[PDB]
Write a protein that binds this ligand. Structure first.
Ligand code: HEM
Ligand code: HEM
Ligand SMILES: CNCC#Cc1cc(F)c(F)c(CCc2cc(C)cc(N)n2)c1
Ligand SMILES: CNCC#Cc1cc(F)c(F)c(CCc2cc(C)cc(N)n2)c1
Ligand SMILES: C[C@H](O)[C@H](O)[C@H]1CNc2nc(N)[nH]c(=O)c2N1
Ligand SMILES: C[C@H](O)[C@H](O)[C@H]1CNc2nc(N)[nH]c(=O)c2N1
Ligand SMILES: [Zn+2]
Lengths: 411, 411
């Protein structure tokens, strides 16, 4: 009930008590572990909402050292009145900022949480239309990009009411490249976005059918039909990918965007649901060089790079895939660093997370963490997180997945 | 009930029913996942149901469930338990049990081979000298001049827990480690404590960097005795690199036979506390973990020095570069000396084929993603993208405490 995690490289042992405050469920049971399942796990009635609000307000007033105070009881009373009356309630700006920052703090799959307290929160709860959503998102993108000196930010659109008036960003990330199925048979651009790219065409977009076409935004306000907008190209910071040794690398024609900005998640704070809450930070190099560039279901460039390196691709035991993989990831970090765009390598990011874990255990009693997601997709065991035992559990406020809107939209 | 796992690279979905036959617990609950935790005395009371369940499985596999042979064996075992408080496995049952303990080992990526295991019955052994002879014959059989063959040797089962057979070595072949007064370590830092025990027990240590440890063998609960494996039985591979001629001058070698000797084999409620088993290496076990863990031989720095990589910032990925070159050298050396080894690309591809086959013929395949995914180049192997279900089936291999912590010394 009071659990210990060991680091097997350093023998440092930490005691976790924070998990006892966990609320939601993991998908595991004592008979089966679902730790490697990507996605384990609907209006909220008047009755479930007030306990959720209480739990959150309890932790908020604790965090400002006003638990059991004047202002604490009054606020509890006031939200209790507002739920009984209005069947919902509205967060104070202070509570919203706290709730967003703690949703990031609680994201057990995120290695970048040492930065959790330095999040810029843009309150977009006064937004009513898709053009207004576009305006808020352009401002976010410009603020977060900051001429390459990236700054973490989240923009929070109005909360779900009765599930019929949902705000949704249909894109999975604010900035992604299009994908097209060729008549010749294969796929041009990003295969992961083929379905979404179609819904852009099959709803209005005129695609330039290229390999790195920044997709338009598909924005849904108040449950209406979504609308297309092009992000101003001057707001989309991109980085051409070259290698500090291989001059032929530029001829591969690779580039990537500077801003990782997740837009399809749901932010839960005190029982309230924010279905449109795009948030952004900066990349860890392996997200681009390992996953985006070298997954077989993505841009899948390993063979081409290895050929240009003239590696022995006859046998897997030559480790030609591994050699190319390293070089590709050297180039990504080199390109971003050269163009002065913020990026972190996996050695620095995971060392930071270990320091963050130790901070959280010391000052908070724990840190929920998903080892399957925290360990980088290359060189796992030479990063310190590989040797770190981690306990995974679900705290709120939280970011949660939600269905893709095209499968849900009453059109 | 049914459970589905998805491969996110291929979209292949599999359906697990085998998890319904799981009895033992995992460590997880609905509120916490313990999937990255390294480590998450028996009476007649509990023994006959464990025996019956094993014998039901055994006779089902031989298409004789409910037969007179099956019923007679259940009767015979029942009377043997109530009369002697234990029972003896037939040779056929022991072989089945050892093969299925391997088949059920959710952390083992090499299970495609599970049905080709050579089982050596050493249940007639009575002294540490007899154990030594059995272990020598195992090492010679399994080594097979470099054409490695999987094998297991099974010493007498536990009775009252005061007469255990134990191999005090964690592996049959391992290099000594010596703590120097200046704080540095010579040899394998992981084996320092065991090396000190051997020295205390009378071993004259050569005090080199690659000294094969003596066997420390405990029969029938007696004090352990020291034995030296004949050097002609210990196959070793000098490590060189196919392009870098300076790599040989690092003075590295490794042994050919990975032979785990500290686990407990549970079959039908019987506990075999001494059951060394061996296969052949996957390259990364040596090149990534043994050589490159900070807590092990830790050769990244000197290798990266001789490669003259930019070692000033981690974002040069000099650690990742050297790591690949070391792992090329391990595979090249083993193949050149015609010693069996498998690279992590081949091994993970075979595991996926094994897993799919097990889902079809058996209804599932328990697998521990955290251990199955290799410690370098994770996401360019197919297991990274494979959802897996972890649950505990018997027969099984289990951990047990190091015997020097529990042994009652006779003197
Ligand atoms: C500032 C630098 C940041 C870095 C380097 C970083 C890094 C990462 C990485 C590497 C992942 C793994 C996801 C994948 O492999 O696709 C991840 C997941 C995640 N990040 Fe962070 N992140 C950062 C900022 C943020 C911020 C600002 C938020 C929210 C305010 C956030 C929320 C999350 C969440 C919720 C996940 C898990 C999503 C899921 O379950 O699929 N991250 N992060
Ligand atoms: C034949 C080739 C084999 C290969 C390539 C192989 C590979 C591996 C690897 C890479 C691991 C992870 C362990 C680590 O990283 O230290 C492992 C674990 C394991 N292997 Fe296999 N193995 C093989 C044969 C066998 C055999 C013959 C047995 C038993 C009869 C076996 C039983 C196990 C068990 C029980 C584990 C779990 C270890 C633990 O939980 O600590 N393996 N194997
Ligand atoms: C479909 N594949 C599974 C997936 C995924 C996935 C889902 C998310 F919500 C999510 F935030 C991420 C991380 C991407 C990311 C986001 C931020 C802000 C920074 C960063 N450096 N990286 C990844
Ligand atoms: C903190 N580390 C704990 C550990 C460990 C550990 C324990 C085991 F029982 C075990 F079999 C292994 C795998 C070694 C191995 C064994 C075989 C037969 C083949 C192979 N290729 N490799 C590793
Ligand atoms: C099946 C498995 O859970 C899946 O491939 C996971 C593994 N770990 C991951 N880790 C990160 N950071 N991102 C991912 O998309 C995944 N995918
Ligand atoms: C903390 C974590 O469970 C631990 O470092 C594990 C991770 N995965 C592993 N995987 C394998 N194959 N072998 C190991 O020793 C480990 N160690
Ligand atoms: Zn679990």
């Amino acid at each position: 009930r009071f659990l210990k995690v060991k680091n097997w490289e350093t023998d440092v042992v930490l005691t976790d008590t924070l998990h006892l405050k966990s609320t939601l469920e993991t998908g595991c049971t004592e008979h089966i572990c679902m730790g490697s399942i990507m996605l384990p796990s609907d209006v909220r009635t008047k009755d479930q909402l007030f306990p959720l609000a209480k739990e959150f307000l309890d932790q908020y007033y604790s965090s400002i050292k006003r638990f059991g105070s004047k202002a604490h009881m009054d606020r509890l009373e006031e939200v209790n009145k507002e739920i009984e009356s209005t069947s919902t309630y509205q967060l104070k700006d202070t509570e919203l900022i706290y709730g967003a920052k703690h949703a990031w703090r609680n994201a057990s799959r995120c290695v970048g949480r040492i930065q959790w307290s330095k999040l810029q929160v843009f309150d977009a709860r006064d937004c009513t239309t898709a053009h207004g959503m576009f305006n808020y998102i352009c401002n976010h993108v410009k603020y977060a990009t900051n001429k390459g000196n990236l700054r973490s930010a989240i923009t929070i659109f109005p909360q779900r009411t009765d599930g019929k008036h949902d705000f949704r960003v249909w894109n999975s990330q604010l900035i992604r490249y299009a994908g097209y199925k060729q008549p010749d048979g294969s796929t041009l651009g990003d295969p992961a976005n083929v379905q979404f790219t179609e819904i852009c065409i099959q709803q209005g977009w005129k695609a330039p059918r290229g390999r790195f076409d920044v997709l338009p935004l598909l924005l849904q306000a108040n449950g209406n039909d979504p609308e297309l907008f092009q992000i101003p190209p001057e707001l989309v910071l991109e980085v051409p990918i070259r290698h500090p040794k291989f001059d032929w690398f530029k001829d591969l024609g690779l580039k990537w965007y500077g801003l990782p900005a997740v837009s399809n998640m749901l932010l839960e704070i005190g029982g309230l649901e924010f279905s449109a809450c795009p948030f952004s930070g900066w990349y860890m190099g392996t997200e681009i060089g390992v996953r985006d560039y070298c997954d077989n279901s993505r841009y899948n460039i390993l063979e081409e790079v290895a050929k240009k390196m003239d590696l022995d691709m006859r046998k897997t035991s030559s480790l030609w895939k591994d050699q190319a993989l390293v070089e590709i990831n050297i180039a990504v970090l080199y390109s971003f660093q050269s163009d002065k765009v913020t990026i972190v390598d996996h050695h620095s990011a995971t060392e930071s997370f270990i320091k963050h874990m130790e901070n959280e255990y010391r000052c908070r009693g724990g840190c929920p963490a998903d080892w399957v997601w925290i360990v980088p997709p290359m060189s796992g065991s030479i990063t310190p997180v590989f040797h770190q035992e981690m306990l995974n559990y679900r705290l709120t406020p939280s970011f949660e997945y939600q269905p893709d809107p095209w499968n849900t939209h009453v059109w």
